[PDB]
Amino acid sequence: RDPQDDVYLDITDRLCFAILYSRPKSASNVHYFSIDNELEYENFYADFGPLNLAMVYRYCCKINKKLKSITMLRKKIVHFTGSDQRKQANAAFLVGCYMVIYLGRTPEEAYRILIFGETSYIPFRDAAYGSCNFYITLLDCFHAVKKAMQYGFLNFNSFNLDEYEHYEKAENGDLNWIIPDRFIAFCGPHSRARLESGYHQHSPETYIQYFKNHNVTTIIRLNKRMYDAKRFTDAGFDHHDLFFADGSTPTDAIVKEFLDICENAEGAIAVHCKAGLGRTGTLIACYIMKHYRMTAAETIAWVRICRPGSVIGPQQQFLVMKQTNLWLEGDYFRQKLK
C-alpha cells in the first residue's frame, strides 16, 4: 500500500510489467502505458474481474502494436498498474494471458514470473451477495486460457472483436459464445419485446436470425416461463425446459438430462436463464468439465472470461464438488465411443 512496495518485473528483454504505488518516473528510452482506465471490468456486485475475452484481445493487440512501432524500437515497454489491488490482479491477468497466448510460455512459468517480485495478488471473487465461498487465482485463469488454445476455444486469428462487443450489450441481446460453434449464453427472452426504453427486453425473434446463421439447433431454458416455446420451435429450433430454482444448484437428474441433450444436439446450443449467468453458466461448465476434463476452477475462469459474472454462490461449490464425477463420466464416454 506504499511506494516501497513498487516492483518491476521483466517479461521479455523489451517488455516490462510494473506495479507502481507512485508517479511513474520517465526516461528517454522507456515507454510507460497503463490500462487501469482503458480496460475496466464492469462489476455486478463485489466481483472485480477477470477481464473479458475482448479486453484480453484488445490488450494483446496493444502490446504487439507497441512492440512493432518504429518510433520506439529502441525503447523498453513498461505496462504499469496502480495501487488498487483489484486493478493489479487484472493487469497481471493480462500480462499473463499475453505470455501464454503469444509468447509460448506455460501457465506456471507465467505465474512464476508475475509473483517473482513477491507480489501478493487477491484472487478473483464471484458475483453473489456477501461472503464468497470460492476464489479463482491467476494460475487458474492461465490454465483455462492455455487449454482453450489447445481446444480451439480461443483463436485470436479468427476472433471477431466488433461482433463480440456488439452482442454482449443488453441492447443487442446480451449474448456470448462460450465454446465457439457449440455454446451460447444469453439473457432469457420475454414474450413480446420492450426495447422501447426503460429496459432492453428482447423477444425470441431478435435471436432467431443470429441463431440460424451460426447453426444453433437447440435451445435450453433453465429460467421460469416468460415466453411460449412455440416461438422458437415454430422456427425449427428444438426447445427444452430444464428449469431449476433461481440461484440454486441443479439436481443430478437435470445435469444428466442437460448433458444428454447437448451430447445429441446436431449443432450449436443456446442456453439461457433469467440473466444467463448463474444457472446458465453452471450447466455449460458441467459439459466442459466432463468433455474437456478441465477443473471446476479452470472451467469457471474460462466462462467468466467469456461472459463475466457466470456461476454464483452455491453454484461454485456445486461444480468443485462434482468435478471428480464428471471427469470419470467423461472418461467412460470417450472410451465407449472408441
Same domain, 209 and 106: no
16 is catalytic: no
Distance separating alpha carbons of residues 152 and 189, to the nearest angstrom:
29
Residue 155 lies in a domain: no
Would residue 186 count as lying in a domain?
A: yes
Distances (CA, A) of 198 to 65, 167, 235, 274: 40, 19, 29, 17
Q: Check whether residue 306 and residue 195 sit in a common domain.
A: yes
CA distance 221 to 239: 8
Do 109 and 248 lie in one domain? The reply is no
Q: How many domains does the chain have?
A: 2
Whole-number Å distance between alpha carbons of 97 and 110? 8
Q: In whole angstroms, what is the distance from residue 148 CA to residue 183 CA?
A: 14
User: Residue 197 pairs with which residues in a beta bridge?
Assistant: none
Clarify whether residues 59 and 114 are in a common domain: yes
Q: Are residues 83 and 209 in the same domain?
A: no
DSSP 172: G
> Rounded CA gap, 22 and 269, in Å?
49
Phi, psi of 78 (to 5 degrees): -125, 115
118, 149, 180: which is the final residue of a domain?
149
CA gap 62, 194 in Å, rounded: 38
Q: Are residues 243 and 132 in the same domain?
A: no
The angle at the Cα of 214, spanning 209 to 219, to the nearest 5 degrees, equals 75
Last residue within a domain, chosen from 119, 149, 179: 149
Task: Note the Cα 127 to chain centre separation in Å.
Answer: 13
Q: Given 16, 141, 273, 286, which residue is catalytic?
A: 273
- CATH number of the domain that 39 lies in? 3.90.190.10
Method by which this entry was solved: X-ray
Look at residues 107, 4, 97 and name the one whose alpha carbon lies nearest to residue 52.
97
**Does 142 lie in the same domain as 179?**
no
Q: In terms of residue numbers, what domain contains 76?
A: 1-149
- Structural domain contains residue 141: yes
- Resolution in Å, one decimal, please: 2.6
Same-domain check for residues 123 and 176 = no
Residues 125 and 218 in one domain: no
Please check whether residue 279 is in contact with residue 244, taking contact to mean a CB–CB distance below 8 angstroms: yes
Q: Give residue 293's region: left, alpha or beta (phi > 0; psi -120 to 50).
A: left
